[PDB]
Amino acid sequence: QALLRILKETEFKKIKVLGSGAFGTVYKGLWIPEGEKVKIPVAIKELRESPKANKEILDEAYVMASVDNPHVCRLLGICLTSTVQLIMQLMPFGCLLDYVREHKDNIGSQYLLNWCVQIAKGMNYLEDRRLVHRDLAARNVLVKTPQHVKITDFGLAKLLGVPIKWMALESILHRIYTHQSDVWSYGVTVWELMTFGSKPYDGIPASEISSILEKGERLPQPPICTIDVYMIMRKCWMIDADSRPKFRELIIEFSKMARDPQRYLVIQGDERMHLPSPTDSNFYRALMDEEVVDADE
Amino acid sequence: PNQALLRILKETEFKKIKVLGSGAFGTVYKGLWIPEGEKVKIPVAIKELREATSPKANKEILDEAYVMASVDNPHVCRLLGICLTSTVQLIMQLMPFGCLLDYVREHKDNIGSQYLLNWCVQIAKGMNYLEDRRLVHRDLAARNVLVKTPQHVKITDFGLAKLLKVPIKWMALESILHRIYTHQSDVWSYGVTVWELMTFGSKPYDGIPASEISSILEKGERLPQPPICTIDVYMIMRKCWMIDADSRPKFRELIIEFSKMARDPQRYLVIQGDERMHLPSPTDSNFYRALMDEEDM
Numbered sequence A: 001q002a003l004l005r006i007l008k009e010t011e012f013k014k015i016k017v018l019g020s021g022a023f024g025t026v027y028k029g030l031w032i033p034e035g036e037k038v039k040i041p042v043a044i045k046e047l048r049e050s051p052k053a054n055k056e057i058l059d060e061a062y063v064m065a066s067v068d069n070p071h072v073c074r075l076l077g078i079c080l081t082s083t084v085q086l087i088m089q090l091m092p093f094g095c096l097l098d099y100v101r102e103h104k105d106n107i108g109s110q111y112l113l114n115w116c117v118q119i120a121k122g123m124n125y126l127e128d129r130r131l132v133h134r135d136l137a138a139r140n141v142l143v144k145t146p147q148h149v150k151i152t153d154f155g156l157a158k159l160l161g162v163p164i165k166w167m168a169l170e171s172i173l174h175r176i177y178t179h180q181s182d183v184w185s186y187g188v189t190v191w192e193l194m195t196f197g198s199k200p201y202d203g204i205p206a207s208e209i210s211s212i213l214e215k216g217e218r219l220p221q222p223p224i225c226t227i228d229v230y231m232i233m234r235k236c237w238m239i240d241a242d243s244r245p246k247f248r249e250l251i252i253e254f255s256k257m258a259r260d261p262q263r264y265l266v267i268q269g270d271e272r273m274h275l276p277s278p279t280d281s282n283f284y285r286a287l288m289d290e291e292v293v294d295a296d297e
Numbered sequence B: 001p002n003q004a005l006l007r008i009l010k011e012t013e014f015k016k017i018k019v020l021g022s023g024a025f026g027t028v029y030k031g032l033w034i035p036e037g038e039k040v041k042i043p044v045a046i047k048e049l050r051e052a053t054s055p056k057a058n059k060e061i062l063d064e065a066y067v068m069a070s071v072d073n074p075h076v077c078r079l080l081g082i083c084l085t086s087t088v089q090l091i092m093q094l095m096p097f098g099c100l101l102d103y104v105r106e107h108k109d110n111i112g113s114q115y116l117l118n119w120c121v122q123i124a125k126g127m128n129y130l131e132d133r134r135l136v137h138r139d140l141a142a143r144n145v146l147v148k149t150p151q152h153v154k155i156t157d158f159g160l161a162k163l164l165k166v167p168i169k170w171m172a173l174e175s176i177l178h179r180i181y182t183h184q185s186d187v188w189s190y191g192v193t194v195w196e197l198m199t200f201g202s203k204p205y206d207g208i209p210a211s212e213i214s215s216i217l218e219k220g221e222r223l224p225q226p227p228i229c230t231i232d233v234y235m236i237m238r239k240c241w242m243i244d245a246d247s248r249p250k251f252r253e254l255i256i257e258f259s260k261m262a263r264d265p266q267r268y269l270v271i272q273g274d275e276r277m278h279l280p281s282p283t284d285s286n287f288y289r290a291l292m293d294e295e296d297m
Ligand SMILES: Nc1ncnc2c1ncn2[C@@H]1O[C@H](COP(=O)(O)OP(=O)(O)NP(=O)(O)O)[C@@H](O)[C@H]1O
Pocket: A018, A019, A020, A021, A022, A023, A024, A025, A026, A043, A088, A089, A090, A091, A092, A094, A095, A135, A139, A140, A142, A152, A153, A163
């Protein structure tokens, strides 16, 4: 358990709020290693408040610390003295939802498909680990670089004790969460990416959602999407959980699509939106990502 | 040499935000890189050469920059980018910890034997790589080893001397006399660098004018045995300073001897409180790597 660093309060300082969610508040922070003059940027999430002892929180944290996948953010450190404060790598680019909105209509097919693949890969790994996210959404995918994204905030929901618009029918009705429910959330997440960050079911009250789903109503096909892409989303949204795609199936399908991106997504000016040149990619990795499917030309 | 390795930056791409220091070749700044079209500001190190350059002169500078950009080793810093402004600027990775010489001075009686020997091994590994590549540093010194993390150091400023007062006190006698530079002369410099670390940052030949160094060297005078250094350690250093270049140790040999010593560090360096001193720990190392050092090492 060298995986999880236990931090003293003196060791770090919250500098500014980056945002807040159902489970807590996230701050840009600095870590000051004892006996050193350096200040290292970090992200701190101070959890919203009942049930659990410090030992139990620690046990859960160890699990969070133990994940090892390029597309999943690993918990790095924890401070338990007052609030539970979780320390993680700070992502300057922020979350994927913010990124897509910011770059609306100016993101390539190659990027969109590759992100779908990456999100699937991280989710599949979580499935391998018998970890259910319970809160997947675009806001919960973090942009390490525009070419590399990572799932975040998994299992917070379990530790602390509501995203209805992202929830699977069964989750809403019976509060049951499973890998297959995560698949429903993935479908919504994909919809967000494809629409450049639109709010799902905008103007529809949370209470209505179950009733509309039961009627067989689903989120609309995004204009950029070919039917094949939309079909994948609809499948994630089937009422019977078992019928939905597996994350491993999803990795395969998106990857295939990624090979001929222009065929599956229709974007004006797509030809000009290709993935970074090797020179640019090498540079990004060196500065930000020391730790991708491509068109078959 | 792979051109994709060196990125050419527009002046508008980056900004200088602080002066880190100055050397014979140039001035080094902390900088921010703003990727075109993005919000983010990414910390970088910029070195701006002292002289203004002709466009003709720069082409030589560029060919050298490509080589500098080609170095691929965990113990050598790789040139990341260049801007051929009126005055040429090199962009590399920022190291918040700074140079090793400053670090040893700052932690002067508080550094353990395990760290010192490990640094020696690491510097040797980086130099061996350069030697393999038929590259001669010409300006090796403790000032020119950067601390990525306390557990990880990298050689820097490779190739600058070639593009460009000389650093007399780190120079082998043949280099002072005839301006002959070789891997074996690099070995001499390595010995001085080891001496700097072992003395926790002492100035070599302090109180002796640089103009008279060759004269003492011909007389057989050498840097004194450091208080913490055992005879076996001092002998390696002395060996680096033989008049006959071919008498000097090979970098490959140095890695082995230092590695062996590192295995039983308290045998080879005798330090007051060495029993007390922090020794790098897996929990600490993981945390540092996740925050600052994701490179294969
Ligand atoms: N590691 C990080 N680096 C940079 N920004 C982060 C990081 N983690 C989270 N954020 C941002 O912090 C803000 C708050 O995140 P969070 O508190 O998790 O709420 P949320 O995920 O948006 N909603 P929720 O589903 O309720 O958790 C969001 O803008 C995130 O994008």
